[PDB]
Design a protein around this nucleic acid. Structure first.
Lengths: 200, 407
RNA sequence: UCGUCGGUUCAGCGACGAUAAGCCGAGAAGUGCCAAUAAAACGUGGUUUGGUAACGCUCGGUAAGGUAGCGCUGAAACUCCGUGCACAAAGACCGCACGGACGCUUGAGUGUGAACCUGGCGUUUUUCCAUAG
DNA sequence: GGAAAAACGCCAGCAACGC
DNA sequence: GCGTTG
């Protein structure tokens, strides 16, 4: 259930300008969904005001927020958008009593946001040549029929030394990949992949 | 200009200390509530205005939706029910601070470069300038009378008038308070703060004052260099006088807290960390006192030589500032103290690019990387200039447009 | 050696405390742990409630200057003398003003020395451990 | 990795009128 | 002198 990051040198079938534009667009939609889910969690928990209610078939705040957000955040994969909205609504529910008491203001989210990835959308592969391919399902079908990306996005990851013990038990079958993220480092201009893994 | 002086509250006059402490803690809880709820209401108005411009076409008028020109006026009307114990002018100033911080930073908050500000537990108590009154008695006491409670809180706590405390007015605070009471200085909006180490309450008075007008020649410039063998070196172009600060006390304190940090359960996080924060607050207070001393010496040595302009480096793009003497200092704190004390003295502070400033010879201007040959001495090649490296650097700082001259 | 009080910070000095990097309470928001029960989203996923006291679990306690006893007198903290004014236990008193004598700093300021622009919020890296090359 | 600390950075420090 | 709103 622990994390290890793996720096991405390049995508295989793309250049570093198409892939970077795709990742900045996905970061914009991830931050939109994170802020809007906090607003809808504020509205759902009561909490609002008189001037907004003086101006639904959902069990929980996650489903209502998901079905509201998924129209405008259409470029993200649906499981990834669900994993993003779950993070925002669980952060609001873990902090709800201090928000009501006035020991805290609103939860907020930074610009250089991580991109979520459920375990159905992460693959890794070694070949006979020696490189390490991470296959990432990052887009939806209305986004893949418009950016004309044909397959899952395949990138090469630096697996050296300390993480090389970690990755092989992933490919053996001994480690299970949990939910991961794609993160960015602004000072290094470096994209990393925070692979979470399981052992019992 | 405006500065701050603190005064220690000895005792309340007509109350006991236990009731007075309970009242102060309750007003702290209400101040923190008011700050965090005003932040929440400003964020909610931001979201409502974005959704209104989406659904309608224009931004909504606050006076039609809320009933108020400002969101501060709506936040007062909301927060006033659960913050009924605060004095209403102090509550209005607190909500004004919260909504002004949210309003000034709204583009940075919308862009994601800044978080929405949350406010902490041990918060100061605001006091508008109409709620402060100090009086000196005939036997030498100083009474500060403070409006802290509302009209319901005075009835529920059995208080009839303002709360009067006794303050200690000694030293430079005697001079500040005597200039307050004669009208020469003017009180601004002030604070009640608390000190956990000594368990002391303080009246933190902000005062407006007009500084002393001098005659200083704007064409004379003093240059300040953060040396590698001494801490600060100061030089001039128009005069061969040179001043320096070396850290003997800095070098002594730096290993008397390194010889102490060589050795370094079940009742929470605030135990297991209580003796190390004493050492950390000691280090922070030492750096604050040292930066105040250094700043007063640097501005005093520019009053002495008639200079009207101070020039020093710019430390935002160096990244090897640990190679200087001081070695890990709060350089920003020192430079901000330099700036406000020079503005109070009448001197302009101009930060310049430290392009090379240690390879240039300061007598002709030839830049060679092999000029300094051992980190204390400076040898030129084109004129044979023999100097101290920090003095040569400080003399290179004191030239009026040296950052354009080098590059 | 570390700390407490002597107006604020750093240092000194006087007087004290110390196994204080100690010792003890209560409580249950969270990370575990144990029981059940398992939503949203696309078999995967992980939900909701209760208990438990292990916790860098939560909120607190716990040492540290001195002071005159018959409504008056006036004792006691960082130089002395005088004259006033104010003060009977104190988290709260040991102070203030004026005059002088002795110093100190550069005729004034000063009375242990130097200094005395803070508070709030944000950011991002650096520490410190754990870990593996 | 985790979980915090500390250096860097910025700005304020209300006003007018009514009971 | 506090309370409310620009």
């Amino acid at each position: 259930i622990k994390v290890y990051r793996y720096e991405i040198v390049k995508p295989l079938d793309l250049d570093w300008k198409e892939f970077g534009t795709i990742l900045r667009q996905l970061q914009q939609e991830t931050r939109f969904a994170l802020n809007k889910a906090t607003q809808l969690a504020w509205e759902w928990m009561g909490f609002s005001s008189d001037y907004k209610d003086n101006h639904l078939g959902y069990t929980n705040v996650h489903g209502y927020a998901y079905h509201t957000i998924k129209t405008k955040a259409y470029r993200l994969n649906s499981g990834n958008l669900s994993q993003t909205i779950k993070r925002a609504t669980d952060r609001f529910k873990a902090y709800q009593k201090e928000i009501l008491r006035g020991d805290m203001s609103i939860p907020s989210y930074k610009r250089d946001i991580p991109l979520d990835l459920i375990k159905e959308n992460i693959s890794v592969n070694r070949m006979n040549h020696g490189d390490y391919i991470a296959s990432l399902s990052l887009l939806s079908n209305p986004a893949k029929q418009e950016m004309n990306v044909k397959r899952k996005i395949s990138v090469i990851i630096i697996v050296r030394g300390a993480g090389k013990t970690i990755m092989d038990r992933i490919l053996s079958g001994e480690y299970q990949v949990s939910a991961s993220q794609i993160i960015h480092d602004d000072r290094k201009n470096k994209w990393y992949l925070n692979i979470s893994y399981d052992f019992e | 200009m405006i500065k701050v002086y603190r005064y220690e509250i000895v005792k309340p006059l007509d109350l006991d200390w236990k009731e007075f402490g309970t009242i102060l803690r309750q007003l702290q809880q209400e101040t923190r509530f008011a700050l965090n709820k005003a932040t929440q209401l400003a964020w909610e108005w931001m979201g409502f205005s974005s959704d209104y411009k989406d659904n309608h076409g224009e931004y909504p008028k606050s006076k039609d939706i809320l009933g108020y020109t400002n969101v501060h006026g709506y936040a007062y009307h909301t927060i006033k029910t659960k913050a009924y114990r605060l004095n209403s002018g102090n509550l209005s100033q607190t909500i004004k601070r919260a909504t002004d911080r949210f309003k000034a930073y709204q583009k940075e908050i919308l862009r994601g470069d800044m978080s929405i500000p949350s406010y902490k537990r041990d918060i100061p108590l605001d006091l508008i300038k109409e709620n402060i009154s100090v009086n000196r008695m005939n036997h030498g006491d100083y009474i500060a009378s403070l409006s802290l409670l509302s009209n319901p809180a005075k009835q529920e706590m059995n208080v009839k008038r303002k709360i009067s405390v006794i303050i200690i007015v000694r030293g430079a605070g005697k001079t500040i308070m005597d200039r307050i009471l004669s009208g020469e200085y003017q009180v601004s909006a002030s604070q009640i703060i608390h000190d956990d180490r000594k368990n002391k309450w303080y009246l933190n008075i902000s005062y407006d004052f007009e500084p002393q007008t001098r005659v200083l020649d704007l064409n004379k410039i003093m240059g300040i260099a953060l040396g590698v063998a001494v801490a600060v070196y100061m030089a001039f172009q128009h005069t061969p006088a040179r001043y320096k600060l070396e850290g003997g006390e800095i070098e002594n304190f730096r290993r008397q807290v390194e010889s102490r940090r060589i050795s370094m359960g079940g009742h929470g996080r605030d135990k297991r960390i209580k003796p190390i924060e004493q050492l950390r607050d000691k280090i922070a207070n030492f750096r604050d006192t040292t930066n105040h001393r250094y700043s007063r010496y640097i501005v005093d040595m520019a009053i002495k030589e008639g200079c009207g302009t101070i020039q020093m480096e710019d430390l935002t793009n160096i990244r090897d500032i640990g190679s200087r003497f001081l070695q890990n200092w709060t350089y920003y704190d020192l430079q901000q103290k330099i700036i406000y004390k020079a503005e109070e003295a009448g001197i302009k502070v101009i930060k310049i690019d430290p392009q090379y400033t240690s390879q240039r010879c300061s007598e002709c201007g030839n830049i060679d990387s092999g000029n300094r040959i051992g980190q204390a001495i400076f040898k030129c090649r084109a004129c044979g200039y023999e100097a101290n490296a920090d003095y040569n650097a400080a003399r290179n700082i004191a030239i009026p447009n040296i950052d354009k001259i080098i590059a």
